[PDB]
Ligand binder design. Structure first.
Ligand SMILES: O=c1[nH]c(CSC2CCNCC2)nc2cc(NC3CCCC3)cc(F)c12
Ligand SMILES: [Cl-]
Ligand SMILES: [Cl-]
Length: 187
């Protein structure tokens, strides 16, 4: 549960890459800084889960990079515990009980998700999520649904709002998503 935080220099190839993807829908926001979260436990759980997904879903590209807006209050919890069950309790439920990730930063940048702190600062993560093989989510899914309702040994990895034109993804467990970068920004 130990972690380090490293601020990225605006001059760093890594900074450019992250800002570039943030600015595809959020260029009208001012970036205050970008930190890399380094949580060795959360990382090793994630890489291990990625290895077994790659052995299992054949040609599927299991890894996506998605945005997660949140309040300042949640940042320490997430940097430590990841996107775990207690955190999942604080998310919406319309597409299932888990943590919600947007394809486009400007979804996450809504004030409902990345609530502005007393100084007007907004917080959005650029998360590695193992979306793997996914299906339409709904409110009743409080665990990953089975492909076959008669066989719970074949589970979907995540759920989405729309399988063929997805806007968001719900992940159920902490080993499925790594909060790699935290973007602090303002209007
Ligand atoms: O990025 C996002 N972060 C969060 C966490 S919000 C919460 C954190 C704890 N403190 C209070 C604020 N939720 C989202 C929900 C989305 N869509 C759902 C809206 C209703 C149906 C689908 C899309 C998103 F991009 C996000
Ligand atoms: Cl797996
Ligand atoms: Cl799973």
């Amino acid at each position: 549960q130990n972690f380090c935080v490293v601020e990225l220099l605006p001059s760093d190839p890594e900074y450019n890459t992250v800002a570039s993807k943030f600015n595809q829908t959020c260029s009208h926001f001012r970036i205050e800084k970008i930190e890399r979260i380094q949580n060795p436990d959360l990382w090793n759980s994630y890489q291990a889960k990625k290895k077994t997904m790659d052995a299992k879903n054949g040609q599927t590209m299991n890894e996506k990079q998605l945005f997660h807006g949140t309040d300042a209050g949640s940042v320490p919890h997430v940097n430590r515990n990841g996107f775990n069950r207690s955190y999942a309790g604080k998310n919406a439920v319309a597409y299932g009980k888990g943590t919600y990730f947007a394809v486009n930063a400007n979804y996450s940048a809504n004030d409902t998700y990345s609530r502005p702190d007393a100084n007007g600062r907004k917080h959005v993560y650029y998360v590695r999520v193992l979306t793997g093989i996914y299906t339409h989510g709904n409110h009743s899914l409080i665990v990953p649904p089975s492909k076959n309702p008669q066989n719970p040994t074949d589970l979907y990895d995540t759920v989405t709002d729309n399988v063929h034109h997805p806007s968001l993804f719900v992940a159920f467990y902490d080993y499925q998503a790594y909060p790699e970068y935290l973007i602090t920004f303002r209007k």
